[PDB]
Amino acid sequence: QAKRCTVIGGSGFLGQHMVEQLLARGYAVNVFDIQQGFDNPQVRFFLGDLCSRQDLYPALKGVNTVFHCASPPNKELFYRVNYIGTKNVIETCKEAGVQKLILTSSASVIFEPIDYYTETKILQERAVLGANDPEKNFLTTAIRPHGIPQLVPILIEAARNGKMKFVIGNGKNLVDFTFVENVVHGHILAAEQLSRDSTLGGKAFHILEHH
């Protein structure tokens, strides 16, 4: 019964899709943002600032996964949204008895000049990854898609030990997917695979291609 979830940034470019893919999978999606980006069926929309617990908790109690995707299109404007409000997303994900928080960070963070927007995406990710807590039944994960600047990682070493963990999917069904749709399929697969293996907990993750 507990396969319910919630998207922060559902009014964004990616949240839109996140929800889309998520409903098809058979999921009671709840959307939380500051505006109403569009209308959709079977998705209770919640509105409010993410920095406020008081405007947020209504949107989280009941669900077992939170997809945090929020990001604006400026220090305080970048600091408060990605840092201050994420710490509140962490604080009230615990209160509302959520079990699985999936952060949508970037790929620029693998760079250790780095802009300020990315200064806040490392701060954010660390926060989210720091809060991994299998004991209090709270597993967090970060996912690094590129884009939604002018420097991007093309290739990543795959350690020859098999020391690195990796997420497996079935590409026979997603033969028709687009770039954005693969960013979502990434978030979801980790999400549902967190529910089996707590040792994805704490880990950032890059997305691979599939022809």
Add this chain to the structure above:
Amino acid sequence: NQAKRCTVIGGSGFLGQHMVEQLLARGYAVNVFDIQQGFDNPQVRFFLGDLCSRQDLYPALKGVNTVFHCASPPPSSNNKELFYRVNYIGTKNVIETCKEAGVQKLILTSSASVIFEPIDYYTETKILQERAVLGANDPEKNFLTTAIRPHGIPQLVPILIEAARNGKMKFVIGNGKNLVDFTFVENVVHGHILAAEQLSRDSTLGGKAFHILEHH
């Protein structure tokens, strides 16, 4: 400039095709070793023969700086021992001819499914082929090797790969505005090339496998 000479073993193939077209754009000399002459262009010396023959192959490599190997049989063939011929033994012969001609770097085009360690004998040969190639990284001899692992030259596919704590994961930077236009194949070529132009700057990348991130 005798450091821009380089050869695309398997250069008549679909990936090989694009490999040479892009490598001509950045001012490389390109021999091409394969079997047929595929789709030709009057700026390439298309050698050809047998991949496993020391002597078909040596003239194709003598004089050049960088070898780009991507000669793999179609995984659809399922001629079991063919995969063992071409991917394994052939590559060994690639490896030694590359040392027998003092070739500086070798970029092998691997398979993303070699990460799966009920698997195709194909992939098993693909793993053999990479341990060899990555096992011949002799920085002192100044022979440097890598393998790139593309996905579409299939029941299981790797969607996500753990990013390490810090430092224990190498990566190749690109300038991600000129390649929003590139097709998938064009980017995969731009991957091997950047690998190669970086194996010169840092000997750190030698002996290491790579996957291809999603973009554009």
